[PDB]
Design a protein around this ligand. Structure first.
Ligand SMILES: [Zn+2]
Ligand SMILES: [Zn+2]
Ligand SMILES: [Zn+2]
Ligand SMILES: [Zn+2]
Lengths: 71, 69
């Protein structure tokens, strides 16, 4: 039904919000510290000097284990 | 259809996986450091001296800003 299409779209959008903002291919699993923005996979987060969201200096990257992880 | 019920269940399970594993009421927004388990809201994470997943000592809690919030 049309209701099925609406639910498919909500699911797709939620799952797309879980992917890296830089490569769009791998799941987000890394946090820039101390700002806390958690928007990148480990590879893309590794060479950034400043946060791509708020421009704060990245002192270090903290790996995150999220219950939503499926890759 | 039956597919509408199947999609409703998938959406419910994904939304539940984004909720605090302790209180089941608020969104996950906190990481236990240094282990990295990110399974609690800020109120439950403030009250735990040990990680509820791996039992490692919590040295500090890091707030996380997730695009899904
Ligand atoms: Zn990436
Ligand atoms: Zn930031
Ligand atoms: Zn909680
Ligand atoms: Zn842990």
């Amino acid at each position: 039904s049309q209701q099925t299409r609406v639910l498919q779209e909500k699911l797709r959008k939620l799952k797309e919000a879980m992917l890296c903002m830089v490569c769009c291919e791998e799941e987000i699993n890394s946090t820039f510290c101390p700002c806390g923005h958690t928007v990148c996979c480990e590879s893309c987060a590794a060479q950034l000097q400043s946060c791509p969201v708020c421009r704060s200096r990245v002192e270090h990257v903290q790996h995150v284990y999220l219950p939503t992880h499926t890759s």
